[PDB]
Amino acid sequence: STLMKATVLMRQPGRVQEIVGALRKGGGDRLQVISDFDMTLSRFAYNGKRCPSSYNILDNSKIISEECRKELTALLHHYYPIEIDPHRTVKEKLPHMVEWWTKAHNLLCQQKIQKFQIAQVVRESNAMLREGYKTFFNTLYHNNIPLFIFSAGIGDILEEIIRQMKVFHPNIHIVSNYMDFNEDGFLQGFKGQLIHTYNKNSSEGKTNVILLGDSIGDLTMADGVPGVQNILKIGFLNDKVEERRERYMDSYDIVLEKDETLDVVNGLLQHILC
Ligand SMILES: Nc1nc(O)c2c(n1)[nH]c[n+]2Cc1ccc(F)c(F)c1
Ligand SMILES: [Mg+2]
Numbered sequence: 039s040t041l042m043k044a045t046v047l048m049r050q051p052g053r054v055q056e057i058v059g060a061l062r063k064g065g066g067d068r069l070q071v072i073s074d075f076d077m078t079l080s081r082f083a084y085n086g087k088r089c090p091s092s093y094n095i096l097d098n099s100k101i102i103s104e105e106c107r108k109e110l111t112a113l114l115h116h117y118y119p120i121e122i123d124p125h126r127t128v129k130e131k132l133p134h135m136v137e138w139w140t141k142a143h144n145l146l147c148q149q150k151i152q153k154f155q156i157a158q159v160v161r162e163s164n165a166m167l168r169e170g171y172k173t174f175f176n177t178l179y180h181n182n183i184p185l186f187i188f189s190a191g192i193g194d195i196l197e198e199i200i201r202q203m204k205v206f207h208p209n210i211h212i213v214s215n216y217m218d219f220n221e222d223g224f225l226q227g228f229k230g231q232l233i234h235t236y237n238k239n240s241s242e243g244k245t246n247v248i249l250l251g252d253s254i255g256d257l258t259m260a261d262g263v264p265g266v267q268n269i270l271k272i273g274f275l276n277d278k279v280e281e282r283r284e285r286y287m288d289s290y291d292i293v294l295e296k297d298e299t300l301d302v303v304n305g306l307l308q309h310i311l312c
Contacts, residue, residue, distance in 0.1 A: 040305030045297035047275075049287045057291060060268040061246050061310045066181045068267075069310065070244040072260045075189035075196055075214075077252040079174075081166040081298050082276040089166045092191035092199075099159035101151050113142055121235065128236055135234040139190070143215065143228050151225040153194075153217070160198040167203055170300035175205035177307050182209065188238040188259050189214040213238070250303060252276055257289050272303060 041048070048054050061069065073079055076091045083089060096102065097110055117138040120131060168174075178185050189196055193214035200206040218227040235255060240262035247260045252274040260269055273290030274297065275282055286293045294302055 040302055040309060041292070043297070043302055045294045046302060047283070047287050047293040047295055048291065050291075054270070054291050057268055057270045058306060058309065061248070061270060061306075064246045064268070066183055066311050068244060068246045069183050069248070070246070070263075071178060071183060071185045071248045071250070072263070073185060073187050073250040074238070074252060074256045074259065075187050076191060077276055078250050078256070078274055079167060079171065079187065079300075080199070081168045082252070082274070083298065084166055090164050092189060092195045095163040095165055095199075096146075096156075096159060096192055096195055099163065101155045101159055102146075102149060106145055106149055109145055110142055113138055113145075131236055135236050136232065139215075139232055139234040143232075147225055147227060149225070151217075153219045153223045153225075156194045156217075157198050157202070160195060160202055165199045165202075167199070167205075168298055168300045170304050171203065172205060173304045174300040174307075175200070175207060175210070177304060177311070179207035179209045181307075181311050183307075183311075184244065185210050187212045187214070188233070188256075190233050190235040190238060191215065192217065248272065248303070248306070250274075251290075254282075254285060254289065270306075272306075 041054070081089045090098065097107055117134060120126060120134045187196065187210060189212070191214055193212050193216035196212055196214055197206065200210065213233065215233050216229040217225050218229050220226045238256070239258055245265050245267040247263060247266055247269040249256070249260050249269060249271045251257065251259065256273070257271060260266060270292070271290045272292045272294065273286050275286045275293050275295045279295055283293070283295070292302065
């Protein structure tokens with residue numbers, strides 16, 4: 039019944055039925071959720087307007103100068119055509135993506151950004167999560183299901199969004215780029231491994247996976263999780279739907295077309311965990 043919502047597309051509904059059945063048989067003990075952030079857990083559009091990405095939330099804020107905003111936009115102008123070019127292989131795109139993210143991160147480090155300002159920028163932003171986010175985050179937490187959120191954005195921004203929406207629970211594990219601040223609270227670098235849009239993947243018995251994404255690249259987020267026995271991939275198809283629908287349906291198990299809610303995922307979780 040969950041899958042009878044009007045936004046639901048399935049190329050092989052019988053296969054979806056078998057995967058959901060295996061997930062239910064395995065129970066929450068075997069389940070983990072692997073999800074993209076922007077335009078998957080965050081809402082795509084509201085009240086006739088696009089909702090901001092994590093990148094937009096910081097870049098359009100009061101703590102980024104207009105000159106820095108122009109330089110970030112110039113980097114985007116150069117690298118976006120490379121990023122989306124289907125005739126460049128993922129391997130050929132990698133060094134360009136590393137360059138772009140390294141350059142953007144360094145520009146942010148050359149501003150005067152203070153830790154306390156991150157909460158402020160998010161609070162003043164138009165950040166929005168999909169409808170049903172409380173049920174989604176609470177169901178996972180109450181059922182002890184780890185949620186891995188991958189984002190090539192800024193971890194601090196993601197965390198403040200989820201915290202300010204009152205759903206940042208200890209079962210959430212964000213894999214993203216976290217800021218490093220000096221003793222005076224000023225941004226000085228980024229922590230750990232660089233995550234760009236083409237290395238959002240894993241690079242305990244939780245062998246069943248629900249993957250949530252909104253781009254064709256998100257299909258790989260669970261690659262490299264060892265010993266996965268069952269995976270159900272759910273893809274939000276937010277825009278350019280006539281152009282994208284076939285490729286989405288042919289790779290994602292379930293596609294949700296212009297669905298600004300987590301209702302289908304929530305219903306699947308309730309079915310699997312009850
Ligand atoms: N705040 C911020 N601003 C940027 O421009 C950043 C960033 N963080 N990290 C990496 N880039 C470059 C980039 C990569 C993908 C995008 F979709 C995009 F809009 C911008
Ligand atoms: Mg996304």
